[PDB]
Design a protein around this ligand. Structure first.
Ligand SMILES: Cc1cc2nc3c(=O)[nH]c(=O)nc-3n(C[C@H](O)[C@H](O)[C@H](O)COP(=O)(O)O)c2cc1C
Ligand code: SF4
Ligand code: SF4
Ligand code: SF4
Ligand code: SF4
Ligand code: SF4
Ligand code: FES
Ligand code: FES
Lengths: 80, 112, 216, 456, 91, 114, 209, 78
């Protein structure tokens, strides 16, 4: 749940406990599927935003990449 | 020694018993699972009263005592709740579980 | 042990200048030309050695300056001269006792040699004399193993030793005159049996010019 | 068929004792640079043909046959890179027991020069680098004077002996690291970084020095090359056994009455090695505690079976051990073996480059256990445990320094276990009893130090 | 449908499958749902019904217990109550 | 019984603010804020226990590697206000001060069994 | 343009010449590691990703072994589980007891892989004990506590390659290898607070936090 | 939980009343006392927790000197 700006958290008079009036701040659900989460979310009648994931771009790596022959300027010094 | 090694023979016995029960009621038993010394029959909701009756009344089963029945919600499924039933045969000293499903709105039939 | 981290007390500064004597710059320009003109950096191992020939040791001014000369950051030459044993980084005296203590020397009385050295002086294997003439260092295998107890001073090895004979040799070097260019006091040549020679019993080598194969 | 006691004209080197002098005319009537012209104009494959049926195994310690090592360097599209190809001669050694490489370059620099060109023709190499140990100052001066008189004679250089063939010998001096004797750490030390080994599936024959293809072969095995090119391959193959064939420099040291270095045929019994040319053992044949063929990096042979043993690759690896470089360090019975192997483990801890974690974290633990076992602050199971943690280092490293450091400890535990337990019970009732890790029960940590224990 | 597969193809103890190349595609249609389960019960032999589904004598298998407990009522004066009390020792 | 933050010999607070007692507490009674102090040493700025939601499982004492918080066998500290029953860092340091002679006796007999 | 092989019975296709660790990540197979990273060069330092490969005598490092056709890879070999416990116990011998004071408590790679792959107990109990590394003041942004370094080279590879600040490096042999500027030189670059998310152990960490 | 190894008998009433439910408790007292003396006689030595430190904690002797055990102690509690 997105936070409420007045009800999120405030520090106590007394000891400085984090007090809250928002009650869905600790609830968090797990779903197997994205369409599972969407079906449950509009089945319960909730306004939702969905965030698309970001995976890593596949790039081919070789260990022999590290020491290929310099014809011109070296322009780099490896360490290992 | 592995603690799961002491179960195995009985677990094989349990497998055979369950393969019989599915063969005896093909209209009503969607599946079964044997984990380790624990049998679970997977049965549909409109199929629960013909199965429990069988489990109460067949001389091989005789699951007389109701033990504990409850629900578990998986919110990622279409049918949100699954309803589990635990039975004890004090004659044959054996337990069984019966799992059906239910949505928030649709019922399960009562075995009271 | 390897000691790495640099203390900046004084006499090891980037503030302190250093550059080659023109003989050593002659040698340096000769040395860099041995490698391809791309890979100039490959010549930093001999050039630091050249700096080690000029100064008593390898300071940080020498390593900074050779990093200036050869298209390099100084951490890349800090790695190179920290990885190697022979780049002595803290100042020593004139002679550098290198006594080998590994098993072919140990089975042949290298301990008698080393305490015959450190009874003569009173110094321990990392310590310098405060005359700054001798610095002891116990060292691994110096490649003279059949010459079975041995040691090294600067570039010359001294072999087949006796604890009677090494106090002899170091009273020779504390007088300034160098004892022998030879490897021991003259019991064999290089690798002989001390008996004599069992093998190569001739006065002219056999030419292999007639023992040739037919295929040429 | 009694292998042993070769003649004199079947020797490969004739200056190994210096009666003939090292200079160039000394090398001419020694018999070298005699028909260089004709063998350089012979084909590269005919050189590799001859080296292949020679049976020339590797003399760096690995033992790999260098006919197939020299023919791995040219896949059939090798001219399709068309640049410079390099040769590297490993003239470094610091392996304990060994001096045979100093014996090559002090005595015979010239047929090293020759074999460098002859192998560079065999591999179509552009140049060659000699890597001598930086400890060997006078030896490097020896070799530079000899290759500059090879330049003056026109025998190598712009056009080597009138052949149209490029060749440069340069000499690089490595300032005191023993891990740089390995192929790939040698390759890296020549490129000018810290001399650490790389991983193998970038093979150096494919991808190597300066990013250009390269081989690293030992100073001996190319100093033998022009001799066996001249004499022919089957005259070399007559010596030794079926796959173990030919000659070898043997440097026999340690506790012999007469330490010396030999040139002797392979597959030879160890008893008529040690008594024929070494005087004998200091105290006779019963004064043998153990024997190390090869350098630091192979296990002990105990006395029972090293009477029966041949000194090839075959009869040592079925004795769970290696020929290595055939340095033979015999052990006096009046000397201690666990002091010696503590010294070996300290050598491996000092000479480890420190790159991969099992070798670098293993050599320190091997030393910390071997000092503790030398004085004896141990339980009798910890020797057991010591075996386990040599099995941990054994095959999980980059280079072969890790299994080099594994092996002498394994030979000690296999062959001298009651030798260790005698010292341990000697500790057990000279002093009180000990826990695991060397702790006694008065031993406590007070301010700074540890007190209560004599701390090995 | 895996119990149909166990009834029609067989078992790893009891393989009723020749034609390994064709046994994969014989697996396949049951994995697609070609056969149904009561069709498998009708197709299958009587001694496979009496071997794998039922007991070898043709009886239903009894509800299994791990460790069976055989009772032994102690009734003499080793009992906890003498006779006349409405509670018994069962051991 | 009640809680105490012990001290070292020669007086040092022992609580290196590792948050383990907070992470394990089954009733979420512990709350800690931690800051690096002037020495560069890691200490708690703020330590706090609610004794109204404490359940006396002893997990906070079992968890601490330094053994900084312990349970003293005092049960006789019954109060009249809730504010008195919220123990900050200072009340618990005063407790670990007061009961230290006793906690010697407790941990001389417990520490092998732990 | 692609190569098909087998990991754990799974059949996987990957672009030619890639790393075996990339084949394992594509097939869903979890392989533990300490000195491999997507945005960095390949080093074979930490020896953690050893893997059983048919037609190979020794377990090979999965991060620098290139992909070849007809390849059969096993990760659940008894030899591989033994190798992972061995290399873990080797890592843990000189690594100091700083887990209550380390900043990577629930975020230590070493620590979460020590449960899943490492040994239960420890046999390190010498009197002489672990080594100790001098603390190295780098700068005001990076707190630096180098007893708990595992020499993964990852910071050095990064500041070499991408940050363009060549002041980091590895100076020494054996256990006396250190990872820092050799002179006690301050490290600048425009992204120097990125080396502290990169170190898997807490040796380089956040100074205001 | 080692009720195989301990010998005892069981009281079972006959009429379904509160009196036999009382009598079987008064006898289960006796049977529990029989368990207690058989378990004090037959107590063995050995570990009291399970053997591995990945499901319950190492002892404080060990986790204050062992690196592995400090890792396991830190993780079983967070
Ligand atoms: C730690 C280590 C040190 C080595 N030192 C040497 C050496 O000093 N001299 C040598 O010839 N080979 C040495 N080797 C073996 C080298 O790798 C050798 O150059 C190569 O493996 C074989 O070359 P070859 O074809 O002549 O046998 C060493 C290997 C390792 C792992
Ligand atoms: S085995 Fe040891 S010395 Fe060799 S590369 Fe690995 S860590 Fe370095
Ligand atoms: S009392 Fe113990 S567990 Fe709590 S923060 Fe302090 S040291 Fe950690
Ligand atoms: S005794 Fe239990 S509830 Fe109380 S503070 Fe400690 S861990 Fe929390
Ligand atoms: S980095 Fe090391 S000391 Fe710090 S928490 Fe992780 S395992 Fe413990
Ligand atoms: S400083 Fe950190 S990232 Fe760099 S090698 Fe050391 S532990 Fe790894
Ligand atoms: S072992 Fe002493 S120098 Fe070779
Ligand atoms: S990550 Fe593959 S070995 Fe370090």
């Amino acid at each position: 749940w997105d936070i409420v700006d007045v009800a999120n958290r405030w520090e106590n008079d007394l000891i400085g406990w984090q007090s809250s009036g928002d009650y869905m701040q600790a609830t968090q659900m797990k779903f197997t599927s994205k369409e599972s989460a969407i079906k449950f979310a509009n089945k319960q009648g909730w306004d939702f935003y969905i965030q698309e994931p970001h995976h890593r771009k596949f790039r081919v790596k070789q260990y022999a990449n590290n020491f290929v022959h310099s014809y011109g300027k070296l322009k780099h010094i490896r360490t290992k | 020694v592995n603690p799961a090694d002491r179960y195995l023979q009985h677990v094989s016995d349990l497998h055979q018993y369950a393969k019989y029960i599915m063969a005896a009621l093909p209209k009503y038993i969607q599946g079964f699972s044997v984990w380790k010394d624990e049998l679970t029959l997977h049965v549909a909701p409109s199929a629960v009263i013909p199965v429990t009756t069988f489990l109460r009344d067949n001389t091989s089963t005789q699951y007389k005592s109701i033990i504990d029945i409850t629900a578990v919600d998986y919110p990622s499924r279409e049918n949100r709740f699954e309803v589990v039933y635990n039975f004890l045969s004090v004659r044959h000293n054996s337990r069984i579980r019966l799992k059906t499903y239910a949505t928030e709105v649709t019922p399960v039939p009562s075995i009271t | 042990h390897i000691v790495s981290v640099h203390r900046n007390t004084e006499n090891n500064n980037p503030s302190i200048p250093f550059e080659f004597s023109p003989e050593n710059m002659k040698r340096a320009e000769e040395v860099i030309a041995k490698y391809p003109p791309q890979y100039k950096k490959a010549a930093v191992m001999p050039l630091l050695d050249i700096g080690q020939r000029q100064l008593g040791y390898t300071s940080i001014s020498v390593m900074n300056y050779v990093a200036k000369l050869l298209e390099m950051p100084p951490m890349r030459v800090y790695e190179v001269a920290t990885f190697y044993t022979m780049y002595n980084r803290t100042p020593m005296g004139r002679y550098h006792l290198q006594i080998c203590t590994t098993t072919p020397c140990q089975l042949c009385g290298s301990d008698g040699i080393m305490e015959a050295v450190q009874n003569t002086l009173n110094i321990k294997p990392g310590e310098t004399t405060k005359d700054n003439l001798f610095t002891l260092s116990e060292v691994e295998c110096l490649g003279a193993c059949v010459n079975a107890p041995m040691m090294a001073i600067n570039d010359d090895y001294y072999e087949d030793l006796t604890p009677e004979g090494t106090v002899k040799l170091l009273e020779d070097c504390k007088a300034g005159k160098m004892p022998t260019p030879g490897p021991e006091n003259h019991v064999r040549r290089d690798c002989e049996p001390a008996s004599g020679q069992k093998v190569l019993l001739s006065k002219e080598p056999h030419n292999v010019a007639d023992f040739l194969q037919e295929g040429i | 068929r009694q292998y042993g006691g070769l003649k004199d004209q079947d020797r490969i080197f004739q200056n190994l004792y210096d009666n003939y002098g090292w200079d160039l005319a000394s090398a001419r009537k020694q018999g070298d640079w005699y028909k260089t012209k004709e063998l350089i104009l012979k084909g590269d494959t005919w050189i590799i043909d001859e080296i292949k049926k020679s049976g020339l195994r590797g003399r760096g310690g690995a033992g790999f046959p260098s006919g197939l090592k020299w023919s791995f360097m040219n896949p059939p599209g090798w001219e399709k890179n068309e640049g410079p190809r390099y040769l590297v001669v490993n003239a470094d050694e610091g392996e304990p027991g060994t001096c045979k490489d100093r014996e090559i370059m002090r005595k015979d620099p010239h047929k090293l020069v020759e074999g460098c060109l002859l192998a560079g023709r065999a591999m179509n190499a552009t140049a060659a680098y000699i890597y001598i140990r930086g400890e060997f100052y006078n030896e490097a001066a020896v070799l530079q004077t000899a290759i500059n008189e090879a330049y003056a004679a026109g025998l190598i250089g712009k056009d080597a002996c009138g052949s149209g063939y490029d060749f440069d010998v340069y000499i690089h001096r490595g300032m005191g690291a023993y891990v740089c004797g390995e192929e790939t750490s040698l390759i890296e030390s020549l490129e000018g970084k810290a001399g650490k080994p790389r991983l193998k599936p970038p093979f150096p024959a494919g991808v190597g020095l300066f990013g250009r293809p390269s081989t690293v072969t030992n100073v001996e095995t190319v100093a033998v090359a022009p001799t066996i090119l001249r004499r022919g391959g089957d005259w070399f193959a007559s010596f030794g056994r079926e796959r173990n064939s030919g000659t070898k420099l043997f440097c026999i040291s340690g506790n012999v009455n007469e330490p010396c270095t030999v040139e002797e045929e392979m597959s030879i019994p160890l008893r008529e090695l040690l008594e024929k040319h070494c005087g004998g053992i200091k105290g006779g044949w019963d004064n043998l505690l153990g024997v190390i063929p090869g350098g630091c990096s192979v296990p002990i042979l105990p006395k029972n079976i090293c009477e029966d043993v041949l000194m090839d690759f075959d009869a040592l690896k079925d004795v769970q051990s290696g020929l290595g470089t055939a340095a033979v360090i015999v052990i006096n019975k009046q000397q201690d073996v666990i002091r010696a192997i503590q010294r070996f483990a300290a050598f491996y801890k000092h000479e480890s480059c420190g790159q991969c974690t099992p070798c670098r974290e293993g050599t320190t633990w091997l030393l910390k256990a071997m000092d503790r076992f030398r004085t004896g602050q141990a339980k009798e199971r910890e020797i057991d445990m010591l075996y386990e943690l040599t099995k941990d280092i054994e095959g999980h490293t980059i280079c072969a320094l890790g299994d080099a450091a594994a092996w002498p400890i394994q030979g000690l535990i296999r062959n001298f276990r009651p030798e260790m337990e005698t010292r341990m019970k000697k500790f057990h009732d000279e002093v009180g009893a000990v826990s695991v890790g060397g702790w006694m029960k008065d031993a406590r940590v007070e301010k700074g130090k540890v007190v209560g224990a004599p701390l090995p | 449908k895996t119990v149909t597969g166990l009834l029609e193809l067989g078992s790893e103890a009891t393989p009723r499958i020749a034609d390994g190349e064709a046994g994969t595609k014989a697996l396949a249609n049951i994995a697609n749902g070609g056969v149904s389960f009561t069709q498998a019960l009708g197709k299958s032999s009587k001694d496979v019904i009496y071997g794998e589904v039922l007991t070898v004598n043709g009886l239903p298998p009894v509800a299994p217990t791990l460790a069976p407990k055989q009772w032994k009522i102690i009734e003499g004066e080793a009992a906890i109550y003498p006779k006349g009390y409405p509670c018994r020792t069962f051991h | 019984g009640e809680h105490a933050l012990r001290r070292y010999p020669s007086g040092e607070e022992r609580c290196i603010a590792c948050k383990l007692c907070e992470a394990i507490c089954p009733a979420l009674a512990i709350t800690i804020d931690a800051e690096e102090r002037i020495d560069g040493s890691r200490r708690t700025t703020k330590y706090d226990i609610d004794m109204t939601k404490c359940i006396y499982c002893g997990y906070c004492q079992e968890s601490c590697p330094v053994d900084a918080i312990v349970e003293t066998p005092n049960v006789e500290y019954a109060t009249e206000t809730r504010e008195e029953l919220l123990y900050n860092k200072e009340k618990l340091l005063a407790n670990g001060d007061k009961w230290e002679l006793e906690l010697q006796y407790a941990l001389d007999a417990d520490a092998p069994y732990r | 343009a692609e190569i098909e092989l087998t990991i754990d019975g799974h059949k996987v296709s990957i672009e030619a010449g890639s790393a075996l660790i990339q084949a394992c990540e594509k097939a869903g197979v979890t392989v533990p590691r300490y000195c491999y990273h997507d945005k960095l060069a390949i080093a074979g330092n930490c020896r953690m990703c050893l893997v059983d490969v048919e037609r190979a005598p020794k377990p090979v490092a999965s991060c620098a072994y290139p992909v070849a056709p007809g390849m059969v890879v096993r990760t659940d070999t008894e030899r591989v589980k033994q190798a992972r416990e061995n290399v873990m116990e080797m890592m843990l011998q000189n690594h100091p007891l700083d887990c209550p004071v380390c900043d990577q408590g629930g975020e230590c790679d070493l620590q979460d892989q020590s449960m899943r792959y490492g040994r239960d107990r420890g046999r390190f109990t010498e009197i002489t004990g672990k080594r100790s590394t001098e603390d190295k003041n780098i700068g005001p942004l990076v707190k630096t506590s180098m007893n708990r370094c595992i020499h993964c080279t990852r910071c050095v590879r990064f500041a070499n390659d991408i940050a363009g600040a060549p002041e980091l490096g590895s100076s020494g042999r054996g256990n006396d290898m250190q990872i820092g500027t050799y002179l006690e030189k301050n490290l600048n670059t425009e992204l120097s607070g990125n080396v502290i998310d990169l170190c898997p152990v807490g040796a380089l960490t956040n100074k205001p936090y | 939980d080692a009720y195989d190894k301990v010998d005892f008998d069981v009281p079972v009433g006959m009429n379904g009343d509160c009196y036999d439910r009382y009598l079987i408790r008064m006898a289960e007292f006796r049977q529990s006392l029989r368990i207690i003396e058989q378990c004090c006689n037959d107590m063995p030595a050995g570990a009291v927790k399970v053997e591995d430190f990945k499901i319950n904690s190492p002892p404080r002797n060990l986790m204050k000197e062992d690196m592995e055990a400090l890792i396991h102690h830190f993780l079983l509690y967070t």
